């Protein structure tokens, strides 16, 4: 039902600031030239990028390659994962290694700091399917929810 947002508050044209500091409409050539100049005059640790959540791997890798070619590695996300320890060096540390279909084989499940209902429903729906058929026993370290 949130496909109605793709029809509203959309960016359809490249914008840029005018002398007054207001956002005006311009071309691709002009804006990309501005950005290319600013990028030319900067180098590592003064450039930085940030991803938002609806981004695709292609844009991520392209921006990483760009920033790398200008020596920056401050590529960051908005979501906080701890690099303390193994961090992103190992996928085992930031994945669902017991894949969603693994909740059907499980006997006990322990939820920590999650409301999987509002956060990943289909996962909560799978947990309920198991709770129904395979007599799964759930536990939760967190705030009490339904």
């Amino acid at each position: 039902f949130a496909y109605d947002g793709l029809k509203r508050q959309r960016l359809t044209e490249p914008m840029v600031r005018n002398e007054k500091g207001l956002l005006t409409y311009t071309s691709w050539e002009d804006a990309l030239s501005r950005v290319a100049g600013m990028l030319q005059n900067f180098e590592g640790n003064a450039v930085a990028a940030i991803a938002g959540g609806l981004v695709d791997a292609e844009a991520l890798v392209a921006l990483k390659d760009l920033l790398n070619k200008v020596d920056s590695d401050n590529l960051c996300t908005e979501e906080i994962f701890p690099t303390e320890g193994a961090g992103t060096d190992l996928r085992s540390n930031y994945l669902l290694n017991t894949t969603i279909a693994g909740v059907e084989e499980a006997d006990v499940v322990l939820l920590v700091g999650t409301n999987p209902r509002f956060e990943a429903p289909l996962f909560n729906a799978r947990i309920r399917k198991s709770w129904l058929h395979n007599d799964l026993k759930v536990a939760l370290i967190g705030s009490p929810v339904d």
Partner: protein
């Protein structure tokens, strides 16, 4: 950009270009090519016409449905212009004429009309105004048309300082008055030229290149407020040009010299025609006026056009004049024209 002006498509008859043009003078030799090149890439063309609706048919097909919007106007009525430029983002004044009328003077078409069009385009929010002056235009020329044209571009720029002014040379095409004229002299069995054609230089350009240049200046952001000189790649002497003409026409070329003080009288006589005259004193003086040298002015190669030499596009104009004996004769049979630098 307004949501309905964003260009969409591949640049075809049914695509969108983002161009909403008002072309004054579309019913002429050059306006038809301009409108063709505009409706070919999917732009809206507003074509104000004073003529009969039977003389816009050749235009009615060179644009997809709704891309061409016709309008009845009058140069004297100023509202007739506001209603036309009321919605455009470009205006292209091609208005001109090679002779004066009972009701219009060179001044009227070359100075006042452009000036009013420019006033209205400025007052109406237009971003671009393309004006078409002449290359040889000057406030010190023997011809009256060129003086008037220079005055007109001065006024257009004093009323619309960001006005793209385009200054072409003698244009040649199918429906022209330059190559067809130099071919139709034959009806008088000989070619009268001043100084025997020498001392005069001509740098003519194909009309399709001019139309491409206009249509590209419509959306070229480095061209605002600039002047251009649309000229062909090769310069010729009137003698060799007309000889090459009669070569493509395969007619007999009998040139003889003629001073200008009697050729202009001939032109006056011919201009007394209440219909479209075959020649005029001003057309005479416009001929035999040498061609200015590029003199640093920007041009077609700066708009994005590679000029087409006359030796490739002359036969499609001059095969209509040949006889059955010479129709099929190829292009290579004619010896090309001498090129000069001067």
């Amino acid at each position: 950009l307004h949501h309905a002006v964003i260009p969409h498509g591949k640049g075809g008859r049914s695509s969108v270009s983002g161009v909403v043009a008002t072309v004054f003078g579309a019913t002429g030799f050059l306006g038809r090519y301009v409108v063709n090149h505009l409706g070919r890439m999917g732009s809206q063309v507003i074509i104000p016409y004073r003529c009969d609706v039977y003389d816009i048919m050749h235009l009615r097909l060179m644009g997809d449905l709704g891309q061409l919007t016709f309008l009845e106007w009058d140069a004297r009525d100023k509202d007739s212009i506001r209603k036309a430029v009321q919605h455009s983002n470009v205006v292209i004044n091609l208005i001109g004429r090679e002779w004066e009328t009972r009701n219009f003077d060179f001044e009227d078409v070359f100075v006042n009309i452009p000036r009013a069009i420019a006033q209205a385009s400025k007052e109406a929010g237009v971003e671009r105004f393309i004006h078409v002056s002449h290359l040889n235009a000057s406030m010190k020329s023997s011809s009256k048309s060129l003086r008037s044209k220079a005055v007109g571009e001065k006024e257009v720029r004093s009323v619309f300082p960001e006005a793209i002014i385009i200054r072409p040379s003698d244009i040649f095409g199918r429906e022209d008055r330059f190559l067809n004229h130099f071919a139709n002299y034959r009806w008088f069995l000989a070619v009268p030229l001043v100084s025997l054609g020498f001392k005069t230089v001509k740098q003519p350009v194909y009309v399709a290149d001019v139309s491409k240049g206009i249509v590209n200046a419509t959306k070229d952001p480095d061209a605002v407020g600039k002047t251009f000189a649309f000229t062909g790649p090769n310069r010729y002497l009137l003698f060799h040009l007309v000889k090459y003409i009669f070569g493509m026409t395969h007619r007999t070329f009998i040139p003889y010299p003629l001073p200008l003080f009697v050729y202009s009288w001939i032109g006056k006589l011919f201009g007394l025609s209440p219909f479209e005259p075959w020649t005029t004193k001003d057309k005479v003086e416009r001929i035999h006026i040498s061609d200015v040298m590029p003199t640093d002015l920007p041009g077609l190669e700066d708009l994005g056009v590679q000029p087409t030499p006359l030796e490739l596009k002359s036969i499609e104009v001059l095969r209509r004049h040949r006889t059955y004996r010479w129709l099929s004769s190829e292009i290579e049979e004619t010896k090309p024209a001498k090129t000069v630098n001067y």
